[model samples]
Target: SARDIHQLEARIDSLAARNSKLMETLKEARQQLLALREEVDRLGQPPSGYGVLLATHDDDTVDVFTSGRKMRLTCSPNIDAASLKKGQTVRLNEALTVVEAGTFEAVGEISTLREILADGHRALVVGHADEERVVWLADPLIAEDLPDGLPEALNDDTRPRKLRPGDSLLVDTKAGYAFERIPLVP
Candidate 1:
């Protein structure tokens, strides 16, 4: 009985920590949202449609406009979620952003790649046939003891290196993973 309480307490503490961290994130996201609304608004530039994204997991994509611009992100599961319902007020942004996913804390580099595909991502593909070998992650949190000191960037690359602070890595915890996206350089 005591052990169960101890375990439950630890779980409670862990969830509380994650919740607090997410609250911090929510605070930051709102601050950014304000800035987002004002960054660019060229009134009367033309009759271009305007609105924010509305994501419906049941539909398997994010609808950005009534004019039909949409994108499906790596992984989202739930109701025809309104997480982006308020997103009807979002701003203009590009889609060529690079991001990180997974946690090597539970798995390793090889497993990271394998699991990425298992999670329905084929590779962390970026660039073109004339593009560069690697790109950067927005705010990566990698480990020093990474296997072979590298995580594969492309689904297929001759070389793989451990993910670094500015690079992406696997950070999966349970059935959950996180990816932090940043604009890919042109």
Candidate 2:
């Protein structure tokens, strides 16, 4: 009977050690889970529109270039002139004015592709209405890497055959360019 008591005690000690290790593993998993949630929250925030500062006319005025165009716009009062510098990246709002000086990156919209024109580079797309808009397609090779790269023309032979009239596209209305095609199945 004394030997049996020693064997039962050893079993209990082993079970307790296993339970302790499992609790520690659970703690680590929960900590990592929370960290991943925070990262997702940050990524969900909207991306800022970017532009290059051409000149600072005054404390409240600036000349900037964005989306292949130039404009003389006013800076937000919150931003001081000290931060405005030539050739620096700036954040622009929907109104096309500087909101934050020199910050990170569009909120592209979904449009329906209507037709491809004689020139393979140009296509017709519409958003919310039947009114078609002509947009240039970037070369597939360049577009794979740079979603917002410059609008270079694609020849008819080199164009992807998958593009159809009913396809969905991610378009930058400001530049009148279609950078991505959204699959219907997805």
Candidate 3:
């Protein structure tokens, strides 16, 4: 009976050592999981713009689509994100908004550059059309970018002007007159 009791104690010691080893392994695994989670968190924020929430994952992973072509995006984890729901709309790429490129800048239609001589003064005939003096000729968002109406070196002031789209013969004042040729899509 004494020998059997000693053998039983040895078996208990072995079992306890195995349990401690298993606990250490589990703790290490948990730490690694946490580190990987933070790495994913640092991946990126949404690529910016309005996106329609397409679906919601039960574990805080949300799917969304954006742009005119449905770029896939994921709203992950629960930290600083919203509780996304299906068919819900959310803002992505917070720095951008979808819109027609040159929609609202002062744009006016071109008619003809008036040449008033002998006490005459008008330089164009487009008045009250856009109420605004924006006139982009041959191209919009790009006016007078072709060089100041044929240099004053061309001699005779009898020639016409390049600003063929304005009202009441104005000098210029979308001013500073620094018109850059910025071509754009609607």
Residues 74-138 of candidate 1 have per-residue lDDT tens digits of: 22343334434312233332342212221223232211221222223222422223322221121
- What digit string (tens of lDDT, one per residue) describes model 3 on residues 1-186? 899999999999999999999999999999999998988887765544554444445654554445544344444333334332222345654544322111122332223234322322222233335343332222222223333455544555343344332222322232211121221122
Which regions of candidate 1 are displaced past 4 Å?
Answer: 42-186
TM-score of 3: 0.27
Clashes of each: 11, 1, 3
Predicted structure 1, TM vs. truth? 0.22
Q: Which runs in model 2 stand beyond 4 Å of their true positions?
A: 1-8, 67-80, 92-186
* TM values, all candidates: 0.22, 0.38, 0.27
lDDT for residue 103 in candidate 3, whole number 0-100: 19
RMSD of 2: 13.2
Best candidate (score: lDDT)? 2
Model 2 lDDT, full chain set: 0.66
